[PDB]
Amino acid sequence: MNITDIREQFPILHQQVNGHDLVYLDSAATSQKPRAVIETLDKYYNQYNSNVHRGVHTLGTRATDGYEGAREKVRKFINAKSMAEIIFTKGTTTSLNMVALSYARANLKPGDEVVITYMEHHANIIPWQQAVKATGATLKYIPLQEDGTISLEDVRETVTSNTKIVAVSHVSNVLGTVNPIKEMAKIAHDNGAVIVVDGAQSTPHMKIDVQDLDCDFFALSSHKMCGPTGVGVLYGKKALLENMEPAEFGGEMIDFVGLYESTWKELPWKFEAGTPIIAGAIGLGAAIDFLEEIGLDEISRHEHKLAAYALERFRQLDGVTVYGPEERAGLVTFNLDDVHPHDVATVLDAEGIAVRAGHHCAQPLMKWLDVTATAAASFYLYNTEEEIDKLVEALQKTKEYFTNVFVDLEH
């Protein structure tokens, strides 16, 4: 894995902001895209754009082959058994919402439990809150340990014979914890529940094998893994998707349409109303080819290196608190003691450094950590040790700068 060679593939990194080299450490909000992806989109709009699934004219055929080819790339990428299990959506949020609407809201009665965890992104909270409100079921939260991980015992405790759904993140965007999805699936299934995995933060960073994880549903977002904006995937087990009603209706997903009643296509088209996201899906194909050429295990190893290096260098700074465990994905959430995270991020941007400050779409988790906001930095396959050095230096400098102003005003 050569990082110089990889960085040469990302045009956006070769620029300055505020007079300094850009240092992009915001990949957990959105990743950057290599030439291969961008040029895939260009080629699509310049040469073979058309509507798909009609195949009566040449361009339409090319477009169709690109689009369904991309479906097959997604299938191999997460190791699903069939393309019928791979549905293209607007992104992880929409995917999770489809499950909550079409699965939860048709199969929850009073009595039923939906169990989430406290570390969940909002996409994996609000749909369930709304499903339980609409059906008079009840929502339960699996508690967290002191280091922000989840114990399987707490899981065994929370899920009972009344649990219909367990909804959890593979990887937390805030704590960087990697949840024990495979064991949690076995637990859920023992109690007769399905598991829905939010795989937004795992898919870009590590091999996903839905047959190994044994999850029922699994959601991911293109923009987090070098892909075009605007597109995501829902994987679901063919037997469950066969029994779910579509979330949206219109052309493309129907077979026969009468005045009053209509029948649906086979999977996957049953779940794709309207002209699909053609170019974004083909670009996502391109992103997958790119990551598979580097190797997901290689990417994973790289991320291990950067995260370990960052935890060490953060521990060398006084007055910084890091949240989450030792074993983690490639991100660090943190606060400078006595400086608000928004201020940290703005000062960091004056040095060319892009990080996130705020609630990270995890307000319940913010409350659990006992804070209003945090700062967060995330590494990806284009990041280096040098970049973490610049971050720690700028945090040192920020500490000095705020203290100096405080002391100055004190006199």
Ligand X SMILES: Cc1ncc(COP(=O)(O)O)c(CN)c1O
Which residues does the annotation mark as catalytic?
Answer: 361
Q: In angstroms, give the least distance from the CB of 366 to ligand X.
A: 15
Residue 364's binding partner out of its own copies, ligand X, none, with CB under 5 to 8 Å set by partner kind: its own copies
Residue 198 contact among its own copies, ligand X, none, beta carbon within 5 to 8 Å by kind? ligand X
What's phi and psi for 181, nearest 5 deg? -60, -45
Nearer to its own copies, 256 or 407 (CB): 256
Task: From the list ligand X, its own copies, none, pick the one residue 363 interacts with, judged by a Cβ distance below 5 to 8 Å according to partner type.
Answer: its own copies
Structure tokens that stand for 59 in this block = 């361009």
Closer to ligand X at the Cβ: 31 or 384?
31
Tokens read off for 383: 């990041």
Cβ-based neighbours of 293, under 8 Å, separated by 6 or more: none
Q: What would the two tokens of residue 315 be? A: 């521990």
Q: How far apart are CA 97 and CA 128, in angstroms?
A: 9
How near is the Cβ of 349 to its own copies at its closest, in Å? 4
Which residues face 262 on adjacent strands? 257
Query: Alpha-carbon distance 186 to 88, whole Å?
Result: 27
Identity of the residue, 157 or 209, whose beta carbon is nearer to its own copies in the bound complex: 157
State the minimum distance, in angstroms, from the CB of residue 312 to its own copies. Answer: 25
Q: Which residues bind ligand X (CB under 6 A)?
A: 91-93, 121, 123, 169, 173, 198, 200-201, 221, 224, 251, 274-275
CB of 350 to ligand X, least distance (A): 25
Q: Which two tokens stand for residue 186?
A: 């076995």
Pick what 211 binds: ligand X, its own copies, none; C-beta below 5 to 8 Å, kind-dependent.
Answer: none
CB-based contacts of 131-135 (< 8 A; 24+ apart in sequence): 131/100, 131/101, 131/104, 131/105, 132/108, 134/105, 135/104, 135/105, 135/108, 135/109, 135/110
CA 397 to chain centre: 32
Please identify, using beta-carbon distances, which residue of 111 and 250 lies nearer to ligand X: 250
Pick from ligand X, its own copies, none: which does 135 bind, CB < 5 to 8 A by kind?
A: none
Cβ proximity to ligand X, 95 vs 102, nearer residue: 95
Q: Are strands 217-221 and 23-24 parallel, antiparallel or unpaired?
A: unpaired
| Closest distance to its own copies from the beta carbon of 316 (Å) | 25
